[PDB]
């Protein structure tokens, strides 16, 4: 076929077809399975050995693979591949933290505490300290992963109009905006069915946003406003440090009914 009705290769009469001079050769490690009647599987499906492929269940598969239905050559292909579940990000981690039965790990770590070789007792001790911490607290390890992210009240990060009518805002606002502009973008990229690279990059950027909201500058580089080399003040930089909330506003405040003069 072609763009216009012309240029089309139309068979003049009876004969057979042969192909020569290929642009390139795609060598696939797969298994072919031709068919005569209707095929039950559609292309893209996961398949195990001995699954009913086509022709009412006569022809089947030999290995684990992905279904690639060819309607031109009239053959169902099976590309040797498993239904393996391997993930990334703080989702797989959330799952692995949900799968944890702390009691059993307490048992195991206690059973390894009897082994010599110095270091094993130490590592088992630390790990068991964490495990028993979670056991005694009542907290769940998967809470170290964030589904819903808390938002600080507005006045504690205010956007106020100063003396000259200008506006002044906290640094947490731009961080929150940086979070939302990637969260919503992710929610659009998911609904519209984006490829894996784009979604992965988006989730990575999301993580890069929450890791800039809670502790900016902690991992890698600190996010700065355009036109300045100044790291934005995160929620960690607010509490910790000599300029932290503790040392500046809890262990020493400024007071009323107080004056100062040359003695």
């Amino acid at each position: 076929a072609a763009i216009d009705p012309e240029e089309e290769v139309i068979a003049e009469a009876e004969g057979v077809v042969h192909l020569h001079e290929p642009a390139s050769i795609l060598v696939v490690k797969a298994r072919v399975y031709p068919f005569e009647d209707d095929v039950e599987v559609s292309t893209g499906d996961r398949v195990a050995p001995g699954d009913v492929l086509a022709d009412g269940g006569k022809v089947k598969s030999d290995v684990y693979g992905r279904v690639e239905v060819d309607l031109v050559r009239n053959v169902v292909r099976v590309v040797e591949s498993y239904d393996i579940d391997a993930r990334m990000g703080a989702e797989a981690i959330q799952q692995l933290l949900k799968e944890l039965d702390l009691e059993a790990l307490e048992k195991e770590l206690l059973e390894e505490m009897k082994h010599p070789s110095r270091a094993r007792r130490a590592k088992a001790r630390k790990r068991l300290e964490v495990v028993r911490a979670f056991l005694d607290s009542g907290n769940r390890p998967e809470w170290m992963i964030l589904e819903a992210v808390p938002v600080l009240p507005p006045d504690l990060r205010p956007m106020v109009q100063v003396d000259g009518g200008r506006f002044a805002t906290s640094d947490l606002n731009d961080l929150y905006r940086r979070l939302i502009n990637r969260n919503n973008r992710l929610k659009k990229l998911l609904a519209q069915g984006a490829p894996e690279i784009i979604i992965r990059n988006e989730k990575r950027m999301l993580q890069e946003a929450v890791d800039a909201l809670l502790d900016n500058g902690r991992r890698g580089a600190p996010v700065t406003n355009p036109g300045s080399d100044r790291p934005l003040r995160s929620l960690t930089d607010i509490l910790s440090g000599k300029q932290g909330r503790f040392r500046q506003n809890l262990l020493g405040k400024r007071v009323d009914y107080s004056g100062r003069s040359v003695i």
Partner: protein
């Protein structure tokens, strides 16, 4: 927060957690009978990007062919590793080969006709049918095939051997077959009468290969 609470809770290194969290390596939650490089996939193993695409989507490779250069192998053929695919192209793996874009499509059109041929009696071998390449007749001496009709010549050659169609107006009056060993003595668009030689047969003549 060194040492990583999450990392120490799951026997994971700082590097490993960095890779899993920031999308640098796949961590397996369910192998499903998968096997990488000989060993079966075990849970909590770190797969890369290639190690994951190979296990989840299989392996394959497209090899560029020079413009004009045809392939030694054909479409749908199974291939071994190191097996040649083209005069300069070598495959790096096993599997089913696939033609990407055939720049040239050759169509072998099936034709079924009926033609006559005169030959000396003691020179021809009697058979009810003739397979390709098979000897049709052996002449002990140079014998000239002669036209039994009159009209214009329509010459139609093959890869080896040829046809001949004598016609008046445009209506065909004769169809002669000239097997391998029969050299034509006429050209296309030639006027021939009755009796004049159209071709010469010498030695052994046989059916062409097609």
């Amino acid at each position: 927060d060194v040492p990583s609470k999450i990392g120490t809770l799951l026997d994971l290194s700082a590097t490993e957690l960095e890779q899993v969290l920031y999308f640098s390596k796949y961590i397996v939650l369910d192998p499903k009978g998968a096997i990488l490089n000989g060993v079966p996939v075990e849970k909590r193993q770190l797969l890369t990007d290639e190690e994951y695409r190979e296990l989840r989507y299989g392996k394959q490779e497209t090899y560029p062919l020079p413009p004009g250069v045809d392939a030694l192998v054909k479409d749908g053929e199974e291939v071994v590793k190191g097996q040649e695919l083209a005069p300069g192209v070598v495959s790096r793996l096993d599997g089913v080969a696939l033609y990407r874009f055939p720049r040239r499509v050759r169509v072998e059109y099936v034709k079924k006709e009926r033609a006559g041929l005169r030959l000396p009696l003691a020179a021809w071998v009697e058979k009810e049918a003739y397979k390709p390449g098979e000897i049709l007749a052996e002449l002990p001496e140079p014998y000239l095939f002669r036209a039994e009709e009159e009209g214009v010549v329509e010459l139609k050659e093959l890869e080896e051997g040829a046809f001949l169609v004598l016609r008046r107006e445009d209506e065909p009056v004769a169809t002669y077959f000239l097997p391998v060993g029969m050299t034509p003595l006429v050209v296309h668009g030639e006027i021939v009468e009755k009796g004049q030689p159209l071709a010469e047969a010498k030695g052994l003549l046989r059916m062409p290969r097609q």
